[PDB]
Amino acid sequence: PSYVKFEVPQELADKVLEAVKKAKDSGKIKKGTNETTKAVERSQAKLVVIAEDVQPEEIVAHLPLLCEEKKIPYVYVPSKKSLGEACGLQVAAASVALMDPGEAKDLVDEIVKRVNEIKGKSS
């Protein structure tokens, strides 16, 4: 679409979905776009996960710019149904925010480094 800023290789996306599953069991997460933006506004999120098949696009089109100015990393995921499954829901989710990775602190730190270098080559 248009709110997708940089390309994410498929091998990195599976790491993100694994981090969500681990963070839910030990740490805290926020499910849904109403709870995700309020965590970004309060500068409480550690990693923001955004789906790639949201219709209409206006639902999540403000998240990339909002967390750019709050200095919060963000990454993309292809399917929202899979993202909803990872966070233990019977329905889809368009955005998730990791309050504290918990058992996935190392796995989250690996992801941020991978994302930061992708944006560096995207100008």
Partner: protein, 169 residues
């Protein structure tokens, strides 16, 4: 809330008006009255009373802009009553759009509307409609007034929001 940021991207004069132009190209080919899966503007829908339960439906209507389709009289008139141009329906196109939606969906009651787009020949509106016979709506305490037969087909008697505005109320 995220609903505050929905209205900011769709606000006034924006790069978003490049995304919205692309949608119009598709909307000109679909039928004139269509059911849509989800509201294009959740901020406007949720304020007018739309919920994510079953029995709420969303309909998009396009009408043709301009003045009234008025014919020149053919019998004898004084010069005051012989003019055609400049007439518009005292009913607004927003109220006209709600009426055409209530014809195609005779079992649902109109709850509100807002427009979504506009081009050189049409105007597009989206109407929030609810099924008053579904057991989910029938048991809702906030819509218990909708079990009165006088509160049905209100759009035809000017009791909606667009009708009150046009009645001078």
């Amino acid at each position: 809330s995220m609903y505050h940021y929905i209205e900011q991207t769709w606000q006034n004069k924006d790069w978003r008006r490049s995304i919205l132009r692309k949608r119009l190209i598709e909307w000109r080919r679909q039928p004139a009255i269509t059911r849509i899966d989800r509201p294009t503007r959740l901020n406007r829908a949720r304020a007018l009373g739309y919920k994510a339960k079953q029995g709420f439906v969303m309909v998009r209507v396009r009408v043709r802009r301009g003045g009234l389709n008025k014919p020149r009289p053919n019998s004898g008139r004084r010069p005051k009553r012989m003019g055609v141009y400049g007439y518009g329906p005292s009913k607004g196109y927003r109220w006209i759009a709600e009426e055409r939606a209530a014809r195609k969906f005779p079992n649902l009651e109109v709850l509100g509307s807002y427009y979504v787009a506009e081009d050189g020949m049409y105007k597009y509106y989206e109407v929030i409609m609810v099924d008053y016979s579904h057991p989910v709506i029938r048991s809702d305490p906030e819509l218990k007034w909708l079990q009165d037969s006088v509160n049905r087909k209100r759009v035809f008697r000017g009791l909606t929001s667009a009708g009150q505005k046009s009645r001078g109320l």
